[PDB]
Design a protein around this nucleic acid. Structure first.
Ligand SMILES: [Mg+2]
Ligand SMILES: [Mg+2]
Ligand SMILES: [Mg+2]
Ligand SMILES: [Mg+2]
Ligand SMILES: [Mg+2]
Ligand SMILES: [Mg+2]
Ligand SMILES: [Mg+2]
Ligand SMILES: [Mg+2]
Ligand SMILES: [Mg+2]
Ligand SMILES: [Mg+2]
Ligand SMILES: [Mg+2]
Ligand SMILES: [Mg+2]
Ligand SMILES: [Mg+2]
Ligand SMILES: [Mg+2]
Ligand SMILES: [Mg+2]
Ligand SMILES: [Mg+2]
Ligand SMILES: [Mg+2]
Ligand SMILES: [Mg+2]
Ligand SMILES: [Mg+2]
Ligand SMILES: [Mg+2]
Ligand SMILES: [Mg+2]
Ligand SMILES: [Mg+2]
Ligand SMILES: [Mg+2]
Ligand SMILES: [Mg+2]
Ligand SMILES: [Mg+2]
Ligand SMILES: [Mg+2]
Ligand SMILES: [Mg+2]
Ligand SMILES: [Mg+2]
Ligand SMILES: [Mg+2]
Ligand SMILES: [Mg+2]
Ligand SMILES: [Mg+2]
Ligand SMILES: [Mg+2]
Ligand SMILES: [Mg+2]
Ligand SMILES: [Mg+2]
Ligand SMILES: [Mg+2]
Ligand SMILES: [Mg+2]
Ligand SMILES: [Mg+2]
Ligand SMILES: [Mg+2]
Ligand SMILES: [Mg+2]
Ligand SMILES: [Mg+2]
Ligand SMILES: [Mg+2]
Ligand SMILES: [Mg+2]
Ligand SMILES: [Mg+2]
Ligand SMILES: [Mg+2]
Ligand SMILES: [Mg+2]
Ligand SMILES: [Mg+2]
Ligand SMILES: [Mg+2]
Ligand SMILES: [Mg+2]
Ligand SMILES: [Mg+2]
Ligand SMILES: [Mg+2]
Ligand SMILES: [Mg+2]
Ligand SMILES: [Mg+2]
Ligand SMILES: [Mg+2]
Ligand SMILES: [Mg+2]
Ligand SMILES: [Mg+2]
Ligand SMILES: [Mg+2]
Ligand SMILES: [Mg+2]
Ligand SMILES: [Mg+2]
Ligand SMILES: [Mg+2]
Ligand SMILES: [Mg+2]
Ligand SMILES: [Mg+2]
Ligand SMILES: [Mg+2]
Ligand SMILES: [Mg+2]
Ligand SMILES: [Mg+2]
Ligand SMILES: [Mg+2]
Ligand SMILES: [Mg+2]
Ligand SMILES: [Mg+2]
Ligand SMILES: [Mg+2]
Ligand SMILES: [Mg+2]
Ligand SMILES: [Mg+2]
Ligand SMILES: [Mg+2]
Ligand SMILES: [Mg+2]
Ligand SMILES: [Mg+2]
Ligand SMILES: [Mg+2]
Ligand SMILES: [Mg+2]
Ligand SMILES: [Mg+2]
Ligand SMILES: [Mg+2]
Ligand SMILES: [Mg+2]
Ligand SMILES: [Mg+2]
Ligand SMILES: [Mg+2]
Ligand SMILES: [Mg+2]
Ligand SMILES: [Mg+2]
Ligand SMILES: [Mg+2]
Ligand SMILES: [Mg+2]
Ligand SMILES: [Mg+2]
Ligand SMILES: [Mg+2]
Ligand SMILES: [Mg+2]
Ligand SMILES: [Mg+2]
Ligand SMILES: [Mg+2]
Ligand SMILES: [Mg+2]
Ligand SMILES: [Mg+2]
Ligand SMILES: [Mg+2]
Ligand SMILES: [Mg+2]
Ligand SMILES: [Mg+2]
Ligand SMILES: [Mg+2]
Ligand SMILES: [Mg+2]
Ligand SMILES: [Mg+2]
Ligand SMILES: [Mg+2]
Ligand SMILES: [Mg+2]
Ligand SMILES: [Mg+2]
Ligand SMILES: [Mg+2]
Ligand SMILES: [Mg+2]
Ligand SMILES: [Mg+2]
Ligand SMILES: [Mg+2]
Ligand SMILES: [Mg+2]
Ligand SMILES: [Mg+2]
Ligand SMILES: [Zn+2]
Lengths: 63, 79, 49
RNA sequence: UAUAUAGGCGUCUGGGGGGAACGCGGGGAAGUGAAACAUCUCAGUACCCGUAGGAAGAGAAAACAAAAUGUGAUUCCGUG
RNA sequence: CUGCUGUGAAUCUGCCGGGACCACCCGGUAAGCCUGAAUACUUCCCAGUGACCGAUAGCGGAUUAGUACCGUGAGGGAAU
RNA sequence: AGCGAAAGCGAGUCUGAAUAGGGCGUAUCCACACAAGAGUGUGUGGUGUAGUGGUGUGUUCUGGACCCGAAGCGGAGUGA
RNA sequence: CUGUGGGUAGGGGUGAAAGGCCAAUCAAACUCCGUGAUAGCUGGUUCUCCCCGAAAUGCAUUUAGGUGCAGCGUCGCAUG
RNA sequence: AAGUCCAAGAGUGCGGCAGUGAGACGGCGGGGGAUAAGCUCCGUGCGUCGAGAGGGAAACAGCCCAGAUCGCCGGCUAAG
RNA sequence: AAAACACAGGUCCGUGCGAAGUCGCAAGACGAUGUAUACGGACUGACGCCUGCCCGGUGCUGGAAGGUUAAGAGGACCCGUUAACUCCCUUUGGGGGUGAAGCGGAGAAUUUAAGCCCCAGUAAACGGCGGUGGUAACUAUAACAUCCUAAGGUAGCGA
RNA sequence: UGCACUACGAGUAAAGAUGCUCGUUACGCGCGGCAGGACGAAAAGACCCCGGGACCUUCACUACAACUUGGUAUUGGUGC
RNA sequence: UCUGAUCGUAUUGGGCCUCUAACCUCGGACCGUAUAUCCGGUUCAGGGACAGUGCCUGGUGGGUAGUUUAACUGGGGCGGUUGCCUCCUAAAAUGUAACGGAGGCGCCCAAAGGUUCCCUCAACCUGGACGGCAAUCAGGUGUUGAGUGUAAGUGCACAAGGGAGCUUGACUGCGAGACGGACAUGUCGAGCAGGGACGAAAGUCGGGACUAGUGAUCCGGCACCUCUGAGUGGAAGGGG
């Protein structure tokens, strides 16, 4: 049978034009008042996933 | 029958990060500390948690200036 | 709470720009301070919501 | 018990049971997985019940579609 | 789309659908029924084939084989 | 052909008030210039960009999934 | 006390009550089926030689005899 | 700055395939214990065993010597 | 194999009769071809003398003036859609505001049962039953003043 | 029931040795007896810990049977 | 024609006493029926729109069913502990274990934040009514022994300690380069622009001398936006 993509990981990870997999940083969904804006803005945008996690994330993404 | 202690905090990895004669980029942080054990020297700035960083590229070198240990960045000549 | 979370809103556009804390025991009235409004483009008074 | 019906008598014609799989309509688990478990899964599976036919079921728009002077009953197969 | 319960209309300037809903447009004409082909399967019969097994293998069963035997019974079940 | 949550725009694109920084993208290398040595950039030329489909091997996913092993759970039946 | 015949059936029966008995079995009988249940646990896994060759640590863990990632092996490529 | 450099079979980056995550004793620095344990817990470009054959310590994983490509009825040595 | 179960005797509770209880999805059956001197359930266990206190907790039974509470009735008020306008502002449009009816969505007031809170009784219902301050016959042998509760061990027995 | 032409002592060793060390003792093979050892046989310890079951209890959780409340359908008429 | 004290009609509820005709009776009789305590019917006598039963609904509910009920741990249990911060162990980089040795945290302050300027304490001696060593005054000695919101450590007298003025940078768009790191977290940061505060200017200001005062994702709320809107226009819903 054809392989199944892990759905929980597809709605969290994405690939760029070259093929590196990007991410979204955590600790930014609530409890924001006490966080300075420098911490808030170093926590947004995408960031490439670590080389250590790149092997498992790839298998979850391709299924 | 029980110990009323046994707690500690994480190590913060403080200390000198760049030593004398070491070439750094402008902006590299050079020594993490609590108080001001090393005071900012020439062309060296001090951060919010008393972290010393380099305001210009060059070579690290320590000194003493009126009984105060200081850290300075020395402009190496452009080849 | 005695130091609850409060929000500050610009008077001239009613947009909630900042959230802070203050003591209700010591500052019973609404807190108002001149803050910066990103769409008004300048510093405006901001009053507690 | 009057209208009468329930019943009773006679004369016909059918029904009953079996069968390996395939069909249709119903009823419907648990082991298991979730690294525990109850939603969830397993699985509408196993099993059970009623019924067939040589196949069945479906089938001739109170359908799709999307501004195309577009397809045109159903079933099945490949993709998507 | 559909079951049980309650309420419950219109016959075409009607009624239904187009992913809450409303308006406009478009598609269709429910509450009646039949329907072949393309699709699924093999108890049984015929004829073949195998980079299938070759007697502890292949069917449980090449021979008394669902036999002898074991069990009250459902049932389990050889060896040659 | 990419950037973007998307509308969209497109060797660009997003954010932003910003010809103002950064993100992702513009195969890769070569040279010649123009700017700074805060890690090199920008631009003009050049070179020009490699995938896909069979199939062997390793690992993996869904399947009993390298082989053996519970106590026990469920369905339908058999037994005084 | 006893013979013959009979009735009660599995979360059920029966019990002058011991969780007793219900076909040499009972804190939920037995048979077949789901089914090759599931086991972070134990066991076993079959010919050869050549080259290289560990770990028993860190971090997290419904975690502590399990696992993920790091460290540490090997092979291929790049650099030198 | 050199050395080693027909080798350490060394670094670093990307990838395929891992196993490991129960360690032991001895030397040196320490916590716990009674400055007890063949105890327990840490540090160590410390060693050996694990995964190490050969010689010495009577025998004797972890101590001393020394790292087994094969053969020889040659020689020189190490610990002793 | 017993001291354990049963037992004859005791009480308590339920049951007015295809009873209650039990087996059944139901029909039906036992109870019982019985009818409160009967039947079921619970505890105790011939006999003899007796069986104290506590109704606060938890059950059981009973009661109702209130508080609280479902579905169901109610649809005030609000929102969507748009016939109509009414205006600019640019012109063959198109956005501003109002927006009736109709259809839709969220839906408040109001009304409404049992239960629970509430108040009573009940222990042969499940359950509970105290101290302190300083004392004499020859030391005693806990029965002077006061704290606390729902009440502070009655009789009998007692290494 | 891995073997086999299977002594003892003091040692050593996974710390309680027929099998290793060093010494002591002992001609080969049987028959009847005894039970000190072979950590003798038997039964994948039942004590203890770990993982999993199972049945039991309850003001653990969540459900369901049963009991019960009200509305409404079956369901109607006159008077207040 | 509102305010009202009113009667009647049409309509519809709430309740009440009823009636019988649904429905109900294991009350009688008779019949199917020779046989029959079944069953059905017919009829008399009783209940009666109640009860029962569908559907919707709230209670009670170990009667039953499925399940959960942590780990570390010098065996397990009982105790204690579980995240964060500071110190010693910890062997002069960093890091380093034990049910090793000691303490803190789950806040606080609209100033205890920003800037500008000014000042130097604690203790001791001497002189003073209450007033005593001690309270405020004056003279001197006094370089840090005081103080720093808050544990501890590192700091700070150049002051980060004390005082006053003004004021909100306890900003918005960003961020070269780094520390730390299994990962996820975390931490520092010059500099550019907008719009400000203080300062003559230089300049400083993205909370607090520093390091605790915190909780991933999912799911949902709210305000704003130029995104989307299942035929179309809206909407609902989604998105930033
Ligand atoms: Mg998907
Ligand atoms: Mg958000
Ligand atoms: Mg913020
Ligand atoms: Mg520390
Ligand atoms: Mg600061
Ligand atoms: Mg104030
Ligand atoms: Mg048939
Ligand atoms: Mg299940
Ligand atoms: Mg499971
Ligand atoms: Mg499992
Ligand atoms: Mg056919
Ligand atoms: Mg047909
Ligand atoms: Mg048909
Ligand atoms: Mg055979
Ligand atoms: Mg042969
Ligand atoms: Mg056979
Ligand atoms: Mg027989
Ligand atoms: Mg895209
Ligand atoms: Mg942004
Ligand atoms: Mg750019
Ligand atoms: Mg090719
Ligand atoms: Mg290939
Ligand atoms: Mg079974
Ligand atoms: Mg039977
Ligand atoms: Mg008899
Ligand atoms: Mg019999
Ligand atoms: Mg029993
Ligand atoms: Mg049997
Ligand atoms: Mg038996
Ligand atoms: Mg059973
Ligand atoms: Mg069972
Ligand atoms: Mg299965
Ligand atoms: Mg298995
Ligand atoms: Mg080697
Ligand atoms: Mg690993
Ligand atoms: Mg590798
Ligand atoms: Mg060398
Ligand atoms: Mg080599
Ligand atoms: Mg190597
Ligand atoms: Mg482990
Ligand atoms: Mg370990
Ligand atoms: Mg070790
Ligand atoms: Mg040891
Ligand atoms: Mg030592
Ligand atoms: Mg120790
Ligand atoms: Mg040891
Ligand atoms: Mg060591
Ligand atoms: Mg090993
Ligand atoms: Mg050796
Ligand atoms: Mg070695
Ligand atoms: Mg040596
Ligand atoms: Mg010699
Ligand atoms: Mg020598
Ligand atoms: Mg006896
Ligand atoms: Mg006996
Ligand atoms: Mg007994
Ligand atoms: Mg009696
Ligand atoms: Mg009683
Ligand atoms: Mg009854
Ligand atoms: Mg009575
Ligand atoms: Mg008794
Ligand atoms: Mg008595
Ligand atoms: Mg009494
Ligand atoms: Mg009482
Ligand atoms: Mg009481
Ligand atoms: Mg009471
Ligand atoms: Mg009372
Ligand atoms: Mg009551
Ligand atoms: Mg309603
Ligand atoms: Mg006594
Ligand atoms: Mg010996
Ligand atoms: Mg010995
Ligand atoms: Mg021996
Ligand atoms: Mg020998
Ligand atoms: Mg002998
Ligand atoms: Mg013997
Ligand atoms: Mg003997
Ligand atoms: Mg044995
Ligand atoms: Mg065992
Ligand atoms: Mg256990
Ligand atoms: Mg009724
Ligand atoms: Mg009803
Ligand atoms: Mg219960
Ligand atoms: Mg239970
Ligand atoms: Mg289960
Ligand atoms: Mg456990
Ligand atoms: Mg444990
Ligand atoms: Mg212990
Ligand atoms: Mg011990
Ligand atoms: Mg150190
Ligand atoms: Mg050191
Ligand atoms: Mg360590
Ligand atoms: Mg504490
Ligand atoms: Mg301050
Ligand atoms: Mg200030
Ligand atoms: Mg003075
Ligand atoms: Mg100050
Ligand atoms: Mg803030
Ligand atoms: Mg960066
Ligand atoms: Mg500016
Ligand atoms: Mg700045
Ligand atoms: Mg800060
Ligand atoms: Mg989740
Ligand atoms: Mg639509
Ligand atoms: Mg639309
Ligand atoms: Mg919206
Ligand atoms: Zn504003």
């Amino acid at each position: 049978p054809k392989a199944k993509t892990h759905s929980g990981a597809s709605k969290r990870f994405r690939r760029t034009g070259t093929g590196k997999i990007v991410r979204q940083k955590a600790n930014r969904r609530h409890l924001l008042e006490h966080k300075p804006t420098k911490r808030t803005r170093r926590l947004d945008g995408r960031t490439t996933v670590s080389a250590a996690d790149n092997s498992r994330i790839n298998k979850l993404l391709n299924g | 029958s029980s110990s009323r202690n046994g707690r500690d905090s994480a190590a913060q990895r403080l200390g000198v990060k760049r030593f004398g004669g070491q070439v750094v980029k402008a902006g590299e942080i050079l020594v993490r500390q609590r108080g001001t054990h090393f005071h900012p020297g020439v062309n060296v700035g001090r951060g919010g948690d008393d972290t010393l960083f380099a305001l210009a590229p060059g070579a690290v070198e320590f000194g003493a200036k009126r009984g105060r240990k200081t850290v300075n960045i020395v402009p190496v000549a452009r080849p | 709470d005695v130091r609850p979370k409060i929000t500050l809103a610009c008077e001239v556009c009613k947009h909630r720009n900042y959230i802070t804390k203050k003591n209700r025991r010591n500052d019973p009235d609404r807190l108002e301070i001149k803050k910066f409004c990103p769409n008004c483009g300048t510093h405006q008074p901001h009053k507690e919501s």
